Write a protein that binds this DNA or RNA. Structure first.
Ligand code: CA
Lengths: 81, 70
DNA sequence: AAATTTGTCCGTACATTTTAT
DNA sequence: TATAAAATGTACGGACAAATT
Protein backbone atom coordinates (compact mmCIF):
# COMPACT_ATOMS: atom_id res chain seq x y z
CA UNK A 1 0.00 0.00 0.00
CA UNK A 2 1.32 3.40 -1.05
CA UNK A 3 0.14 6.67 0.41
CA UNK A 4 -1.24 9.84 -1.22
CA UNK A 5 -0.27 13.15 0.39
CA UNK A 6 -3.77 14.33 -0.61
CA UNK A 7 -3.68 18.00 0.42
CA UNK A 8 -6.34 19.51 -1.87
CA UNK A 9 -4.37 21.92 -4.10
CA UNK A 10 -3.24 25.42 -3.23
CA UNK A 11 -0.19 24.71 -1.06
CA UNK A 12 3.12 24.36 -2.95
CA UNK A 13 3.41 20.68 -2.03
CA UNK A 14 0.21 19.18 -3.48
CA UNK A 15 0.02 17.08 -6.66
CA UNK A 16 -3.00 15.52 -8.36
CA UNK A 17 -3.37 11.79 -7.64
CA UNK A 18 -2.27 10.74 -11.14
CA UNK A 19 0.94 12.75 -10.71
CA UNK A 20 1.75 11.14 -7.34
CA UNK A 21 1.18 7.74 -8.94
CA UNK A 22 3.49 8.71 -11.82
CA UNK A 23 6.15 9.79 -9.34
CA UNK A 24 6.00 6.56 -7.36
CA UNK A 25 6.19 4.33 -10.45
CA UNK A 26 8.94 6.45 -12.00
CA UNK A 27 10.68 6.01 -8.67
CA UNK A 28 10.51 2.21 -8.90
CA UNK A 29 12.09 2.41 -12.35
CA UNK A 30 14.76 4.91 -11.27
CA UNK A 31 15.75 2.97 -8.16
CA UNK A 32 15.99 -0.17 -10.27
CA UNK A 33 13.26 -1.97 -8.32
CA UNK A 34 11.93 -2.89 -11.79
CA UNK A 35 14.23 -3.67 -14.74
CA UNK A 36 13.78 -3.16 -18.50
CA UNK A 37 11.27 -5.60 -20.01
CA UNK A 38 10.04 -6.58 -16.53
CA UNK A 39 6.29 -6.31 -15.83
CA UNK A 40 4.93 -3.74 -13.40
CA UNK A 41 1.81 -4.65 -11.40
CA UNK A 42 -1.53 -4.91 -13.21
CA UNK A 43 -3.96 -2.00 -13.38
CA UNK A 44 -6.19 -3.72 -10.78
CA UNK A 45 -3.28 -4.23 -8.39
CA UNK A 46 -2.21 -0.60 -8.79
CA UNK A 47 -5.80 0.47 -8.13
CA UNK A 48 -5.85 -1.47 -4.88
CA UNK A 49 -2.35 -0.54 -3.72
CA UNK A 50 -2.64 3.18 -4.45
CA UNK A 51 -6.33 3.36 -3.51
CA UNK A 52 -7.39 5.18 -6.70
CA UNK A 53 -9.61 4.55 -9.76
CA UNK A 54 -8.66 2.65 -12.90
CA UNK A 55 -8.92 5.98 -14.75
CA UNK A 56 -6.27 7.52 -12.48
CA UNK A 57 -3.91 4.56 -12.91
CA UNK A 58 -4.39 4.65 -16.71
CA UNK A 59 -3.67 8.38 -16.79
CA UNK A 60 -0.40 7.90 -14.88
CA UNK A 61 0.65 4.92 -16.95
CA UNK A 62 -0.30 6.61 -20.24
CA UNK A 63 1.79 9.63 -19.37
CA UNK A 64 4.72 7.34 -18.53
CA UNK A 65 4.32 5.45 -21.83
CA UNK A 66 4.28 8.64 -23.88
CA UNK A 67 7.44 9.59 -21.97
CA UNK A 68 9.24 6.42 -23.04
CA UNK A 69 9.51 4.97 -19.53
CA UNK A 70 7.03 2.13 -20.07
CA UNK A 71 5.32 0.12 -22.79
CA UNK A 72 2.08 -1.85 -22.78
CA UNK A 73 0.80 -5.01 -24.45
CA UNK A 74 -2.95 -5.47 -24.63
CA UNK A 75 -3.88 -8.52 -22.59
CA UNK A 76 -0.24 -9.03 -21.59
CA UNK A 77 0.70 -6.25 -19.17
CA UNK A 78 2.86 -3.15 -18.76
CA UNK A 79 6.67 -3.23 -18.72
CA UNK A 80 9.63 -0.92 -18.00
CA UNK A 81 11.08 0.16 -21.35
CA UNK B 1 -8.25 -2.99 -41.83
CA UNK B 2 -9.38 0.55 -42.66
CA UNK B 3 -10.80 0.78 -39.14
CA UNK B 4 -9.47 3.33 -36.63
CA UNK B 5 -10.78 3.99 -33.16
CA UNK B 6 -12.88 7.14 -32.78
CA UNK B 7 -10.24 9.08 -30.83
CA UNK B 8 -7.81 8.36 -33.68
CA UNK B 9 -10.21 9.65 -36.35
CA UNK B 10 -10.75 12.76 -34.27
CA UNK B 11 -6.97 13.13 -34.01
CA UNK B 12 -6.62 12.75 -37.78
CA UNK B 13 -9.23 15.42 -38.52
CA UNK B 14 -7.83 17.99 -36.04
CA UNK B 15 -4.30 17.35 -37.27
CA UNK B 16 -5.64 17.79 -40.80
CA UNK B 17 -7.07 21.21 -39.91
CA UNK B 18 -3.64 22.24 -38.62
CA UNK B 19 -1.65 20.78 -41.53
CA UNK B 20 -3.80 22.61 -44.10
CA UNK B 21 -3.26 25.85 -42.23
CA UNK B 22 -6.98 26.23 -41.50
CA UNK B 23 -5.83 27.27 -38.03
CA UNK B 24 -2.52 29.03 -37.39
CA UNK B 25 -0.23 28.86 -34.32
CA UNK B 26 -1.74 30.44 -31.19
CA UNK B 27 -5.19 30.25 -32.77
CA UNK B 28 -7.85 28.41 -30.75
CA UNK B 29 -9.49 25.18 -31.86
CA UNK B 30 -13.17 24.62 -31.07
CA UNK B 31 -14.21 23.89 -27.47
CA UNK B 32 -14.47 20.36 -26.10
CA UNK B 33 -18.28 20.65 -26.22
CA UNK B 34 -18.32 21.89 -29.84
CA UNK B 35 -16.02 19.03 -30.78
CA UNK B 36 -18.30 16.54 -28.96
CA UNK B 37 -21.28 17.88 -30.89
CA UNK B 38 -19.53 18.01 -34.28
CA UNK B 39 -17.94 14.55 -34.07
CA UNK B 40 -20.82 12.93 -32.19
CA UNK B 41 -18.58 11.43 -29.49
CA UNK B 42 -18.03 11.66 -25.70
CA UNK B 43 -16.07 14.33 -23.87
CA UNK B 44 -13.69 11.47 -22.93
CA UNK B 45 -12.97 10.68 -26.57
CA UNK B 46 -12.35 14.31 -27.40
CA UNK B 47 -9.98 14.69 -24.41
CA UNK B 48 -8.08 11.56 -25.43
CA UNK B 49 -7.57 12.95 -28.92
CA UNK B 50 -6.57 16.39 -27.75
CA UNK B 51 -4.30 15.00 -25.00
CA UNK B 52 -2.45 12.86 -27.54
CA UNK B 53 -1.99 15.89 -29.82
CA UNK B 54 -0.75 18.03 -26.88
CA UNK B 55 1.74 15.34 -25.92
CA UNK B 56 3.10 15.21 -29.48
CA UNK B 57 3.41 18.99 -29.42
CA UNK B 58 0.81 19.95 -32.01
CA UNK B 59 -1.44 21.71 -29.47
CA UNK B 60 -1.33 23.37 -26.04
CA UNK B 61 -4.16 23.92 -23.55
CA UNK B 62 -5.00 26.61 -21.00
CA UNK B 63 -7.46 25.66 -18.27
CA UNK B 64 -10.50 27.87 -18.60
CA UNK B 65 -9.10 29.42 -21.81
CA UNK B 66 -9.20 26.83 -24.57
CA UNK B 67 -6.93 24.69 -26.71
CA UNK B 68 -4.56 26.20 -29.28
CA UNK B 69 -2.29 25.21 -32.19
CA UNK B 70 1.34 25.25 -31.04
C1' DA C 1 -20.18 38.06 -10.18
C1' DA C 2 -21.81 34.80 -13.60
C1' DA C 3 -20.87 31.87 -17.26
C1' DT C 4 -17.75 29.24 -19.86
C1' DT C 5 -14.05 26.08 -20.53
C1' DT C 6 -10.45 22.87 -19.30
C1' DG C 7 -8.66 19.62 -15.40
C1' DT C 8 -9.23 15.86 -12.09
C1' DC C 9 -11.50 11.75 -10.45
C1' DC C 10 -14.67 8.39 -10.34
C1' DG C 11 -18.01 4.58 -12.20
C1' DT C 12 -19.80 1.06 -15.83
C1' DA C 13 -19.68 -1.85 -19.93
C1' DC C 14 -17.74 -4.28 -23.50
C1' DA C 15 -13.86 -5.44 -27.03
C1' DT C 16 -9.38 -7.32 -27.94
C1' DT C 17 -5.30 -9.71 -26.91
C1' DT C 18 -2.63 -12.49 -24.11
C1' DT C 19 -2.02 -15.99 -20.69
C1' DA C 20 -3.66 -19.90 -17.78
C1' DT C 21 -6.56 -24.02 -17.34
C1' DT D 1 -6.77 -28.37 -29.24
C1' DA D 2 -10.35 -25.57 -27.17
C1' DT D 3 -12.27 -22.69 -23.26
C1' DA D 4 -11.90 -19.65 -19.59
C1' DA D 5 -9.74 -16.16 -17.18
C1' DA D 6 -7.01 -12.26 -16.92
C1' DA D 7 -5.20 -7.85 -18.56
C1' DT D 8 -5.09 -3.85 -21.45
C1' DG D 9 -7.91 -0.68 -24.94
C1' DT D 10 -11.95 1.99 -26.22
C1' DA D 11 -16.03 4.49 -25.15
C1' DC D 12 -19.24 6.33 -22.34
C1' DG D 13 -21.47 8.64 -18.44
C1' DG D 14 -21.43 11.89 -14.00
C1' DA D 15 -19.78 15.19 -10.49
C1' DC D 16 -16.94 18.90 -8.96
C1' DA D 17 -12.64 21.95 -9.08
C1' DA D 18 -9.75 25.68 -11.08
C1' DA D 19 -8.82 29.17 -14.31
C1' DT D 20 -10.19 32.18 -17.83
C1' DT D 21 -13.51 35.07 -20.21
CA1 CA E 1 -13.67 30.81 -20.07
Amino acid sequence: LEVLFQGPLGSEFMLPKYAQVKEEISSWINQGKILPDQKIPTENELMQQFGVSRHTIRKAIGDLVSQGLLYSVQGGGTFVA
